[PDB]
Write a protein that holds these residues in place. Structure first.
Motif, short mmCIF file in Angstrom:
data_model
loop_
_atom_site.label_atom_id
_atom_site.label_comp_id
_atom_site.label_asym_id
_atom_site.label_seq_id
_atom_site.Cartn_x
_atom_site.Cartn_y
_atom_site.Cartn_z
N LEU A 37 0.80 -1.22 0.00
CA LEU A 37 0.00 0.00 0.00
C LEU A 37 0.83 1.27 0.00
N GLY A 38 2.08 1.21 0.43
CA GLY A 38 2.93 2.39 0.47
C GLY A 38 4.35 1.96 0.79
N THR A 39 5.31 2.81 0.43
CA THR A 39 6.71 2.42 0.65
C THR A 39 7.60 3.66 0.76
N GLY A 40 8.65 3.54 1.57
CA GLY A 40 9.54 4.63 1.91
C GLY A 40 10.96 4.15 2.10
N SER A 41 11.81 5.01 2.67
CA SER A 41 13.23 4.71 2.74
C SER A 41 13.59 3.69 3.83
N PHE A 42 12.76 3.51 4.86
CA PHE A 42 13.06 2.49 5.87
C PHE A 42 11.90 1.56 6.20
N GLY A 43 10.78 1.67 5.50
CA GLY A 43 9.68 0.76 5.74
C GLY A 43 8.68 0.75 4.61
N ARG A 44 7.61 -0.02 4.83
CA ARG A 44 6.50 -0.15 3.90
C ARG A 44 5.24 -0.39 4.70
N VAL A 45 4.10 -0.20 4.05
CA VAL A 45 2.82 -0.59 4.60
C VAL A 45 2.19 -1.60 3.65
N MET A 46 1.74 -2.71 4.21
CA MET A 46 1.19 -3.83 3.48
C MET A 46 -0.26 -4.03 3.88
N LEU A 47 -1.09 -4.40 2.92
CA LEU A 47 -2.36 -5.04 3.25
C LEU A 47 -2.08 -6.50 3.56
N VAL A 48 -2.58 -6.95 4.70
CA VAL A 48 -2.48 -8.33 5.15
C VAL A 48 -3.87 -8.81 5.57
N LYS A 49 -4.02 -10.13 5.64
CA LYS A 49 -5.25 -10.76 6.12
C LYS A 49 -4.87 -11.75 7.20
N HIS A 50 -5.53 -11.65 8.35
CA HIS A 50 -5.32 -12.61 9.43
C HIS A 50 -5.89 -13.97 9.03
N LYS A 51 -5.07 -15.01 9.14
CA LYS A 51 -5.41 -16.33 8.58
C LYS A 51 -6.52 -17.04 9.35
N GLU A 52 -6.73 -16.70 10.61
CA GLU A 52 -7.78 -17.34 11.39
C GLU A 52 -9.07 -16.54 11.41
N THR A 53 -9.01 -15.22 11.60
CA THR A 53 -10.24 -14.44 11.68
C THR A 53 -10.71 -13.94 10.33
#
Ligand SMILES: Nc1cccc(-c2cnco2)c1
Ligand SMILES: Nc1cccc(-c2cnco2)c1
Ligand SMILES: Nc1cccc(-c2cnco2)c1
Length: 338
Positions: A37-53
């Motif tokens: 979803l977004g990215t920078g010089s020391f990190g990123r933001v990801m869409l994730v899905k919790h596998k149980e809920t």
């Protein structure tokens, strides 16, 4: 007395979490990776899905070695300790946090409506009622944060997500700090920096009120008040005491902006004896029902279009890179408290 008692309870609840922060409340293999979803010089933001809920979340992943190299250690510790302790309707909620050999992880509620940045650029500019609706939410959010001795320090359209009801949720606390007296770090985004940051002063929450002036101007005009090819050129405009307004701005809007974009921090609205009330009682906000905004009872100007809680259409496309975890622990000492 209503506001006093609200803020007293807010500080009580914040301090209890501040003094005993949560740690290690999930792990990476509880989640499936969906999209960047977004990215920078020391990190990123990801869409994730919790596998149980099956719940979706926005997972911010910070590379510990890059955090160290770019002098962001204390800032990342600030971000997580603050986020796990705050609670307000217009702040994105931290749901879990953890770390591993390589990275730090903050798992946030996923807000599919996207950043205000995209909507503002797409629409061109927001009408004054539309800008005012968002501005009111920021005023209340800063009243909350400042009462906890926090400074936000990164107000800008990219950091304001629009939720399913059309309300703002503030994201990215990477520059937020609990400030004992005053602070000195040069950080923020150039177009939004207050003069006292540019001039290397010890500064306070007045920098957030300056940034609100920049944001309101940008929302209502479509572009920020101070811009240029090089940062030093932006900074010269910021410190100059001069700002030009579009003729379509109302007189009330111009008056408020002159008082937020006040170069002398000792004269700036939000930093005077009457505090936030100089802003809340300004004529530009005369139509604002502050309680109804807080209670999310006002119909929003705009509801983002999206297909469901997993839709990524309001975020743009980035190269999909690995989430690698070293076989050896990196920077363990530096991030002990995370
Ligand atoms: N800062 C940042 C960047 C991109 C997406 C997000 C996001 C989405 N839902 C919650 O946070 C946050
Ligand atoms: N524990 C801790 C850490 C950093 C700042 C502060 C702070 C600021 N104003 C009152 O307390 C407190
Ligand atoms: N951020 C920072 C730096 C140095 C001291 C402090 C602090 C908080 N309470 C007493 O001292 C906070």
């Amino acid at each position: 007395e209503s506001v006093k008692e609200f803020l007293a309870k807010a500080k009580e609840e914040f301090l209890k979490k501040w003094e005993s922060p949560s740690q290690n409340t999930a792990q990476l293999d509880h989640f499936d990776r969906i999209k960047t979803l977004g990215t920078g010089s020391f990190g990123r933001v990801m869409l994730v899905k919790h596998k149980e809920t099956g719940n979706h979340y926005a997972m911010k992943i910070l590379d510990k070695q890059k955090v160290v190299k770019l002098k962001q250690i204390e800032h990342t510790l600030n971000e997580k300790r603050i986020l796990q302790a705050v609670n307000f309707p217009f702040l994105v909620k931290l749901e879990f946090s953890f770390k591993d050999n390589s990275n730090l992880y903050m798992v946030m509620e996923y807000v599919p409506g996207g950043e205000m940045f995209s909507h503002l650029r797409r629409i061109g500019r927001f009408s004054e009622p539309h800008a005012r609706f968002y501005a009111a939410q920021i005023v209340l959010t800063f009243e909350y944060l400042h009462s906890l001795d926090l400074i936000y320090r990164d107000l800008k359209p990219e950091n304001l997500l629009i939720d399913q009801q059309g309300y703002i949720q503030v994201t990215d606390f990477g520059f937020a700090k609990r400030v004992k007296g005053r602070t000195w770090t040069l950080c923020g985004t150039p177009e939004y920096l207050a003069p006292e940051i540019i001039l290397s002063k010890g500064y306070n929450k007045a920098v957030d009120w300056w940034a609100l002036g920049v944001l309101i101007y940008e929302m209502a005009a479509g572009y920020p008040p101070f811009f240029a090819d090089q940062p030093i050129q932006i900074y010269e405009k910021i410190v100059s005491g001069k700002v030009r307004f579009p003729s379509h701005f109302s007189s009330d809007l111009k008056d408020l902006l002159r008082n937020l974009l006040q170069v002398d921090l000792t004269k700036r609205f939000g930093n005077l004896k009457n505090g936030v009330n100089d802003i809340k009682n300004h004529k530009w906000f005369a139509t604002t029902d502050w309680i109804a905004i807080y209670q999310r009872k006002v119909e929003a100007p705009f509801i983002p279009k999206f297909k469901g809680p997993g839709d990524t259409s309001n975020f743009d496309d980035y190269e999909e890179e690995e989430i690698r975890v070293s076989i050896n622990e990196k920077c363990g000492k530096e991030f002990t408290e995370f």
